[model samples]
Target chain A: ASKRALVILAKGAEEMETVIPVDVMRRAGIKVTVAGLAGKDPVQCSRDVVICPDASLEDAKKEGPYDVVVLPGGNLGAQNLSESAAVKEILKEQENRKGLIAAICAGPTALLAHEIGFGSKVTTHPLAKDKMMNGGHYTYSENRVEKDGLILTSRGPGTSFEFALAIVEALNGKEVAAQVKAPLVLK
Target chain B: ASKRALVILAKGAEEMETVIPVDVMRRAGIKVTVAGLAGKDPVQCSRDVVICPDASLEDAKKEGPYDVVVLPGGNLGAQNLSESAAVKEILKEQENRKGLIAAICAGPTALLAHEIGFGSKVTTHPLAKDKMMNGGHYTYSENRVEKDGLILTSRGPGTSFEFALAIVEALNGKEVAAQVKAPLVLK
Candidate 1:
């Protein structure tokens, strides 16, 4: 079976952080399924942006398992996803297996809420230091992305390219990630 | 009268890119209105996320002469906004008056379509260099933000903070922009 990564798209996710990785991963040939925590329908971004998910977490849980879980950060998105019982279950299971669980910006807060980052090196939006300190090693990097263990996090919106690159590295390899980064010219 | 900025929202528009600036600007005391390009109520994002807008563009346009027209970029947001005649008209009128017509990532392509980037230096999502070149000198930068005259642009999701910072600089000044940056530990 082809390895599949689950990209969680909760209500009010930061659209670019969510979608750019999807595009970049697909470009690198990663089969990413967009899972919505809300419902079967499409989700809306802050300011009324709309996005349709590939599947619902309800369906994914019933279907079986996924290799990796990715969460994009937005102010409300992290808050919303962390509040989902389904998301909490998935994060707990992933943590149990030590499987790859990635998030960026405010997303690390969600991981913290799920108790997924205790004693792990991670990072998040600068404003999230207090929350991040509650769980993991919070590094403040101006670089595009950062990874600690099977968990990866980025600073904020500007780091999408690096965040995408980091995801590509995790799924494919450093070489494929290099190819993606070469085109992006990310520093 | 106080200045008003309208941010266009649609499917695939980077939510953080759209909202962070609005939040930061509101903190800076700017009046920002999230105007939906479609739908009467609220809209959905690519991941089935949903949000409410301040008003529809149809209604917002009727409300006034805005000082700036901002477009947040994502995978299909530029295409979505450019395809809309109302959006094109808004860009056109804003350009005609030399009102701030700012776009980031593929969002700038909408401005290029409206003939707004002529002879200006701009930045965009790395994948969009060729397209942005059709209208202006598109410089590739790892920096968070860039501003050419009244037109502001950023790279992608990670650049949202820098983008919002640039907007702060545009609306208020470097001093105020610095204050906002201080909280985020950016600058």
Candidate 2:
């Protein structure tokens, strides 16, 4: 089956975190949907880069069960995701169904907020570790990218490529990830 | 003095290349303008990421004499830039003023197209070296990032961080670049 990825786009999301994963995943031939959390209107990111999502979360949710659910992080964006009831349900369903859920930077904080995937080893932007570890629900790892079964997480904007390629490798294969990685000229 | 940057956003641009530098520059406290080459409407990137520009290139030009002019690469986007009279004028003016001109991936090909920064040792995405070498105007390097005076060039999406950090180092000095680089969790 063709792989599909849904990247939740929230106000104040890290533009690099969002775009890197989307672009890299697309390069791996994943059908990615950049769904705006609030609506489909252009979202102003943490650093002020405005991105227009492919669809509204309300609209995109109907087209479920995506192969992967990606969360890109900015502090405020993660807080926004944490507070959303809709996101909670989506994570809950994805967890129950055992679909892959990937997050980066402060993104994993949203997973904590939703109380999804406790007991998994995770990492976040160093500045965000306390927030992500508030309850000691999850074990922390210093690895650049950490994956425990269906929950895949990575640190800040710099780890985006690795985070993305990890997703590609999961959905496709190492061969496909290597194929896509070669052209990116990644270090 | 505050550093300013002009990131020309053309249609079919590499979203990763476009966003990475813009985000990294902003993190370094540089003022960056993401100007659309076409108009102020949303730009559909090569990977299908739609970005809303800060202003049109026509409007941004009036505000310039920026520290660095950045070109992000997607073959089609670079083609669009290579074909632009406005871009030609901007690069020419930047060159005359001796401001830094930075382009990555196929972006260096646009520099070739406009005949800007000839004789500078530059590097392009491996696939783009042939096109960038069309006239033998510049010396080529295989380095991940290459800098020759005011012209800075880099390979592809993976080299974007290095390209952006080099711009920061040039404009704000190495300490600032180091500070900016540390938090990114770059490997």
Candidate 3:
């Protein structure tokens, strides 16, 4: 009866933003799936670190419905996610089901692209503000991590830990999140 | 010319620690090689995230000497590193050349095993203090990140940003590090 999370791994994704949440979520005992957007192959991240995903988005879709869908961002990664019909369908389904949809940095721009979670107060990397606010569908915040209902968003690599911990607290509890955070030696 | 770094990736390495540094260093325009210690293969990290190393350590060694050598920590990963004669030789050569040697969390234990940087001020994850101070070869500090001459160390997953920026400052300069840090949206 563990919470399940689907993290879509696309080429050019921010590796730190991607790995930190995935690692921290697994530490919190969540069943986390790193699903590749392309297929079950190694993904070259924004900074060129390559990572192998647990499953392809096509395969992982059959294993749903996940409690959360996570999007980690780099400029190009978000663009990839934003342009994916598969990602759009997944986000829409998660939204309709009232499941948490978490995105970070430029990742939130994917939500903007898909028209999901409109009107939710969210935050993206400062540089991505204009891209995310084209129509002002959502109110913007400068908070490190922002949660409005089931839509959770955070800024950049530095905010990943907080973003992940928020997801944990929502899915598990505050106690479990606290337990997981202490060993991380966070300042 | 851009500086180069060699990150020794091993089984059970903390993926967050490993990816954060590699990704962040590359963002700073450092040419970083994610070198697998065992061979040219994907490494299963402590939290079960698999990372594909850029090259085998043997091949990467031929390209040395690098500006910095980074070690990421998981207890088992550090143990794997601690037991390697190859790692010992690499640390020694880097030290002899007065190049920077960086390790984080339990990673400094490998330095302990290899007998490198003795008498330098260092820091490790709080739980790793005893293991690192087994012979008291180095002075310990409680700082989030500690840099002593050619040796750099940091606490745990959360201190990775600080640790990586410190390495950038050493190899590139404070201004480059600052420029890189700003885009990361660090608190």
Candidate 4:
């Protein structure tokens, strides 16, 4: 059986964090979907890099029960995700099904907003730590990539490759992740 | 004055490579233009990641003499760059002016196609080495990021950070590049 991954893309998303995980998961043979949180129109990222999603989240939700749901971060992008009623439902469903939920940078802040992973060990971009720790609901780690059972989190764009490989290892296997990492020439 | 970069976005370009440099350069305060090769529309990358370029290459050329011209690689994207008359003029103009021109992965192959930096030492994705070295037009290197004068090249997606930082160091300064790098959390 093939594993399916859903990556939610919002306007102001960090383009590097968004693209690296999507590209790397594809390399590991995961059927990855880059879903637009808005419509299916092109998304303007934080640095102004624009990306057109594979499908709108409204449409993609119907194809549900994905193995993993990825959230890429930027301050504004995460805020958008945090405010979405649709996003809240999706996170709830994924959590209910015990599927892996991966978020990076300010992305984990959405997990906080949705109240999806309270009490889980998590990490986020240093700048976002204060927000994720609001009320101290979750245990925080400084590790680049942190995974506590089904909820996975990472720091920032610098940790995107590591964050992505962690997703690969979680969904695919260590061997697949290692094989995919070799060509990337990561330090 | 802030440095400027022009990134040519062709159909089938590597989305990760394209987005990383664009985003990283912006972090360094470099003004970047993501120019579409075909027209002012969304470019479908090799991995099927669609990117909406800021403007058409035709229009962007008029705004040049930029500080750096970046080329990102996907086999077909490089082929598109190799076959472009417009790209030839851009590279020739940049080269004649002694400005920095950086390419990554299969991107360096386009240099061979355009005859832009013959005899320069470069590196490409391992899979792309044979093609880049096909005619013996340039020297090959195994270094993750290779810079021979104004020509900068890197291996693949994993090396994108190093590649972008090298460009920053070239155009901005080492201090700026290092400050930008510290936040990325690169290993």
Candidate 5:
């Protein structure tokens, strides 16, 4: 099976949480499609880093399907992306496919707001505990990654490597992810 | 006098290292000019965040110059920025004006490589000591920020706040920089 993941690139996305996973996943032989919410060219992250979108969400929702949808959270990026109609539609589709829906840090807030966590356990940046508690059942993990069903989440930049590794394992199995981590000295 | 600083937007620039300083400084009322060596728009930081440039070094070199230049070190960002001719010219200009040049982590390598350290003392990210030492009389300080003449440097991401404050102190005076630090709870 082809291993693939989708990253939703929106305005004000956190740079590290977004890029590290793509880097680690590619290193693990997983293909990633950066679905840009705005346009096809470059989307600006927090601090003005411009990222080019591999494809538009309209295209992603139509022809392309992913095994996992990864959201890298920035306080601003998450807030904006969660409101996108395309993102909401994608999450709704994820329900039937049982495709992994993962978020890191503030990224999970979008999932919560989007109502993707009606009965799902999730994790996010520490500042998000109160919100998570109010929204759904929250379990805290000292480990960078927290996996429940097809939903995966992580803390923040500090845990990006482990979080990406967790996603890699979920997609391509533990052996392949281990190889990716080994070269980066993360595992 | 208008306080100005150059932000290096190159590949592999750390997200936090770049964001914290740029955000903190802009909030502090400093004029930040993003100079990109790669292109007009869309430069990816180390972790996948995209940074857009405010100006190209080609144009920035002609603008009445800048007061300070900051290097936000990441893996490739540091290397790419250091190798740019515009950055090289700015380093030389900063030396001539006795203006402060700040670098954090591996950011200091750019300064040293440019031969901007004829009679300066500097510091950098901990992993950068050997390289910083090779540059000149740099004494490591556990303190987040260090200042020696027109040169200011710091250890790593943890020190970005202190590094920006030092630049503010150098350009806009201590009072203003302190105001910016107060809210962030930076000591």
Candidate 6:
């Protein structure tokens, strides 16, 4: 069976981070859903690019138990995710199910906000470190992408490909990940 | 003066390639306009991700003489660009004015379609090579990103950052490109 992945999209989200993972996962044959946090409206990203999500979070949640939940970060996008009760419920449920939670840039900070992966080693964009470490609930790593069991985190946009590939490796396998990565012409 | 970039967005565009450059260029302080090829409606990308362009190409063309014009690739999107009389006019104007024109993945194929940058060295997604090499009108290189004077080209989604940075370097100079690249945490 094909694995399922859910990506939560909020206004001000990092468009590159959001698109890269969704695109790469689909390339790996994962059923990837880009769920909007604010209904099924078009989302204005941090860079002002607007993306229309596949479905609203409310609608997608009912379709869950996804194998992975992805979060892409822009400061304001992360803040919006941090403040959403809907997002909190999704993260908690995914955690309870021991499913993978992947986040990049400021996205990982939302994991902290939801208390989804306390004590796991994670990483975030350098600018987001202080916010993500407010209570030091989770140990921090400077690695480009940090995978501590179900909690997967990465730095900013530059590491999005690596972060997405890690998710592919987890759901698919190393061979599948390599096959997907090669055509991308990554250095 | 701030450099301005115009990214032509069309239905069936590669969302990753489209968003990566737009976001990165915005980070470099480029005033970017995501212009839709077919009016102002949201564009459905090759992977089915929908993107709402900032303005219609018709509207943006009047405001141009932009510092750079970007072409992102999905086979269908490039085909749309190739078939558009408006795109032909835009590329011709940019070229005649000696402005920068950058294309990625199958995007360089559009340059061939419009006969915009003949005889320049370029690169495209490996899958796009055969189409781009037809007619022997341009020189081809396998380099991830190729720049010959004002024309810049890149391979696929994986090389988007390098492609965007090259545009930043062309318009904003090395200092600005380096500054923008650091925060991206690129490899």
lDDT of 3 by residue, B68-113 (tens): 9999998999999999989999999999999999999999999999
Per DockQ, what order, best first? 2, 3, 6, 4, 5, 1
Give per-residue CA lDDT, model 1, range B61-170, as digits (tens): 87757777889887677889878889888877877787887787788888777666576667888787787776344545444477778778778655666777777778
The parts of candidate 6 lying over 4 Å away from their true place are none
On residues A1-187, what C-alpha lDDT tens digit does candidate 5 reach at each position? 6788888888898766777787777767777888887767677777565667778877766755788898888789888877887888888788667889889888887777777856666667777667666734555554467888987988876577778889989989999987766534221
| Residue range A27-121, candidate 4, lDDT tens digits | 89999999999978889999998888999999999898899999999999999999999999999999999999999999999999999989999
Top-scoring candidate (lDDT) = 3
lDDT of 4 at A139: 99
Evaluate fnat for each of the predicted models and list the values in order: 0.08, 0.92, 0.92, 0.84, 0.19, 0.86
Off by over 4 Å in 5: A1-3, A15-17, A20-30, A46-48, A61-67, A125-146, A154-187, B1-3, B11-30, B38-41, B44-50, B63-67, B74-80, B104-106, B118-150, B153-187
* CAPRI band for model 3: high
lDDT of 6 at A10: 98
Recovered share of real interface contacts in candidate 6: 0.86
lDDT of 3 by residue, A1-187 (tens): 8999999999999999999999999999999999999999999999988999999999999899999999999999999999999999999999999999999999999999999999999999999999999998999999999999999999999999999999999999999999999999998
lDDT over C-alpha atoms for residue B7 of model 1? 83
**What's model 3's TM-score?**
0.99
Total backbone collisions, model 4: 1
Model 2, range A7-64, lDDT digits (tens) per residue? 9999999999999999999988999999999999999999999999999999999899
Candidate 4 stretches with Cα past 4 Å from truth are none
Local error of candidate 1 at residue B174 (angstroms)? 1.9
Q: State the TM-score of the second chain for every model.
A: 0.89, 0.99, 0.99, 0.98, 0.90, 0.99
- Write the residue-wise lDDT of candidate 1 on A61-130 in tens digits: 6664666788888889999988988999998888788788889788888887777756666677777668
Go through the candidates in order and give each one's DockQ. Answer: 0.16, 0.92, 0.92, 0.83, 0.17, 0.87
What TM-score does structure 5 among the candidates reach? Answer: 0.71
lDDT of each: 0.73, 0.95, 0.96, 0.94, 0.74, 0.94
Q: In candidate 3, residue B145 scores what lDDT?
A: 97
True contacts kept of 3: 0.92
How many pairs of residues collide in each model? Answer: 26, 0, 0, 1, 10, 0
lDDT score at residue B41, model 5, on the 0-100 scale: 62
Residue B45 shift from truth in candidate 1, angstroms: 7.6
